């Protein structure tokens, strides 16, 4: 563009989207509205718990939960690790990070937080699955 064209219409940068929109929103109950706040995790209640089939070429029964967050947004969260103790009405902590195999699963459920238990029999990378030191 000419300098005159830049002066008339300055350059405009591309806007960046969040990978975890459900964590960027809080809810004010008194005013019954949403509010913009960046959060690293959110509490939620597991509306459903079950398994999903990944997209090709992968094949598996990946464990996930449909969770209502404290801000009233309903999301799918993956359950990492081997074995979990989650059912409907379980209260779980949700963090960002999607599962590439699972199409609509954009969050993870923290292990070893609120109701969710650590992975039983985990000994390497235990902090990633909320397992205490066996000793």
């Amino acid at each position: 563009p000419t300098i005159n064209q830049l002066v008339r219409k300055p350059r405009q940068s591309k806007i960046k989207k969040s990978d975890s929109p459900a964590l960027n929103k809080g809810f004010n109950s008194k005013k019954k509205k949403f509010t913009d706040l960046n959060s690293p995790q959110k509490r939620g209640v597991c509306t459903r718990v079950g398994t999903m089939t990944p997209k090709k070429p992968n094949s598996a029964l990946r464990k996930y939960a449909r969770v209502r967050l404290s801000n009233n947004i309903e999301i799918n969260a993956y359950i990492p690790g081997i074995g979990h103790n989650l059912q409907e009405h379980s209260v779980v902590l949700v963090r960002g990070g999607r599962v590439k195999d699972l199409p609509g699963v954009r969050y993870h459920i923290v292990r070893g937080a609120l109701d969710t238990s650590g992975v039983d029999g985990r000994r390497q990378g235990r902090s990633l699955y909320g397992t205490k030191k066996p000793k």
């Binding site: 300098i3 005159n4 830049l6 002066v7 300055p10």
Partner: protein, 80 residues
């Protein structure tokens, strides 16, 4: 002692009684691209005798508030 700001500009309207609006022209530079771009600011100045006329280049000086938006007084008519 202390003097007050003085501007020179063209008259662009005098339909008001004893008040003329003076258009002072300046050139602010674009802060990023650095090009020279025109900047106009209209000044409401006091014209007691209606001496100034639409078109003439006049001189104004800052004064105390004289009206809702009048802050200047005509000093002399530089050209006509």
């Amino acid at each position: 002692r202390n003097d007050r700001k003085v501007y020179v500009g063209k008259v662009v309207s005098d339909k008001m009684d004893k008040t003329i609006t003076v258009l002072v022209e300046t050139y602010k530079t674009h802060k990023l691209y650095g090009k020279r771009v025109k900047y106009s600011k209209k000044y409401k100045t006091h014209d007691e005798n209606n001496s100034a006329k639409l078109g003439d280049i006049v001189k104004i000086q800052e004064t105390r508030p004289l009206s809702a938006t009048k802050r200047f007084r005509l000093v002399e008519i530089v050209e006509e």
